[PDB]
């Protein structure tokens, strides 16, 4: 139903302690980075969201977070969702922080939003106040400025973020172009915290608009 | 049923009277383009054809166009598809005669050909008499010269071609390896009118051949 | 159900006797290749290895192979698959002993084994005692020397690649970085038959921890 939120679910989660050479060389790890926290999930913009801060509340950092091919419904196997990410930290402890830290959020009620009857589209539009490590990087901003996560289909993204644009002082720091792996698209927006919230709120609008009239233009 | 053509569908279509300088950024827009045409549908190939065709028919570029992962049938939303196109163009107007020209092209009977008795083998021959200025760029051709357009799965599309290229007079001009997005394969060759028509029927004859001895040597 | 044996199947073959030369450039073949070999499947890794047998068989090359996007599961037409392969050959009798040979492997008993009781979970342990010139090419040693060729899903791959590495003397060649095309995820690992051997036990018996207890 239109309005109802999509609730989004961790699949796996595993430590690896004492990292072996060899992969700590692939995964090009930091010389303090002995243990990794993996984790699996069936939505991948949250999972980038709940990683991110992981980073804040814990000692750990995202090193490697991708997003699968066709989405979680067209999932294989029973453990790969749309989304693996590792944490990277000193210690099992620590990942274990940025781990829960990471569930946490997870379920803490933040996620893709459908835009009509039976949910066939969907959105995400999520201010973080405040980003960590792995955001701000992404984003290609200072580390603790807030970002408006936009994400929708291809062609509601490329109208909702104009509308988005338009609503309020934002700049486009990193655009998704469509396709992702899971065939959406989108952008991480920044600016002032208001200015971001207003951005999410004319995304969300926007996608609904073309969700209620697909073909009306 | 075998030689039945697959009718292609448009899912969704909008116009963006005016989009933001953030958004001209990053999809690299020439300061002339003030509006955009945004289309979705469940057949790329077609589609492309289809925004070629619009460039000939009115003031607009094609300045987006890609393919979702693993198909229209693998879509996770509704309005997905698996192709976005975009159109830009001086005003709404004109970009409304481009999109015009676009969904009549669409309908026009052009589409995938079934190969087997129950259509899970298809193929595209389309014959462009006169390329617009997208597919003409897209083969390093000039505009208004000829293609054949040729699409099929991965095998066949190797099979086939190869034995276009032997049964008629064209030259290859853009190799689609395999897997596109869609996970199929195919080329533009590009020759005379005739030449062209000639490469499409022994494209269709050998992926149809295929179809019904795929295990023979 | 767990170990069972997931069946590899060839979907479609064919010769190619004298390829055009625009195909041959697109393909950047080498100037003796003259005949191709095709072949698509619904198990990447196993035809992999598989054309990697065929170059051992006859004189042949692996000049393409690539896997579909989203597997074999999610293939939308009849012939895809999740993988195709091309082997060049100086003529069309040696493609057909190669194709023979990669025919013959697929069905010799390879492939994924299931690690819980729906299959929904499975994994690759495959030790090639003796590379050919193309998986020998791909992991960076020599033709002739052994390999552990490792693939599962994206977290159970990383947590058994760890243990594998651990549980014996090898050296990573090459990281499947996930998501592969088919959202799977492993890596190439060589060393002495012996020891590649412990590491394709280790990396299914991590596998299968992690599939008995996913979330922990
Ligand atoms: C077919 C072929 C072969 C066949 C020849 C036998 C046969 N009947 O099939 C085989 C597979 C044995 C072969 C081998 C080699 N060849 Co050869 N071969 C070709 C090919 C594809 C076509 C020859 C042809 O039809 N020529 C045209 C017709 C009109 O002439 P022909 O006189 O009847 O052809 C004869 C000679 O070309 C000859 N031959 C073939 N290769 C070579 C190489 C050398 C150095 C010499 C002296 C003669 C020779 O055998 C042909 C008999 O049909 C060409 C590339 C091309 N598209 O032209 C390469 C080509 C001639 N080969 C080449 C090479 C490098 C080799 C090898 C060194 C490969 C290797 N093993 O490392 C060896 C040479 C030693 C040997 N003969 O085993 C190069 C030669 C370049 C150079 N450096 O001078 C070419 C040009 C390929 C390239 N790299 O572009 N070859
Ligand atoms: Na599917």
Redesign the interface.
């Known amino acids: 139903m239109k309005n109802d939120l999509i609730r989004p679910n ?5 430590i ?1 302690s004492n ?2 050479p ?2 700590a ?2 995964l090009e790890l930091e010389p303090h980075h002995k243990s ?1 926290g ?3 999930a069936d939505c991948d913009d949250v999972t980038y969201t709940a990683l991110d801060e992981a980073t804040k509340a814990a000692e750990v950092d995202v090193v490697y977070a ?6 979680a ?8 969702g749309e989304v ?1 990410g ?1 944490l990277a930290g000193p210690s099992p402890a620590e990942v274990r922080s940025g781990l829960n830290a990471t569930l946490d959020f997870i379920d803490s009620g933040v996620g893709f939003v459908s835009a ?1 009857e039976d949910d ?3 959105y995400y539009a999520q201010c973080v106040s405040r980003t960590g490590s792995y955001l701000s990087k992404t984003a290609g901003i200072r580390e603790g400025e807030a970002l408006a996560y936009l994400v929708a ?4 993204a ?2 909702a ?2 509308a988005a ?2 609503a309020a002082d ?3 720091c990193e ?1 998704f ?3 992702t ?5 989108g ?1 991480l927006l920044t600016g002032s915290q208001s200015a971001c919230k207003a951005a999410c709120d004319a995304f969300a609008e926007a996608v609904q608009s ?2 209620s009239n ?2 009306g ?1």
């Open positions: 961790v699949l796996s989660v595993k690896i990292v072996s060899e992969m060389k692939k990794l993996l984790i699996t991708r997003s699968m091919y066709a989405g419904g067209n999932a294989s196997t029973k453990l790969a693996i590792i009509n066939s589209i969907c289909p291809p062609l509601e490329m109208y973020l104009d644009l338009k934002v700049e486009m655009f172009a469509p396709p792996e899971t065939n959406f698209a952008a073309v969700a697909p073909l233009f």
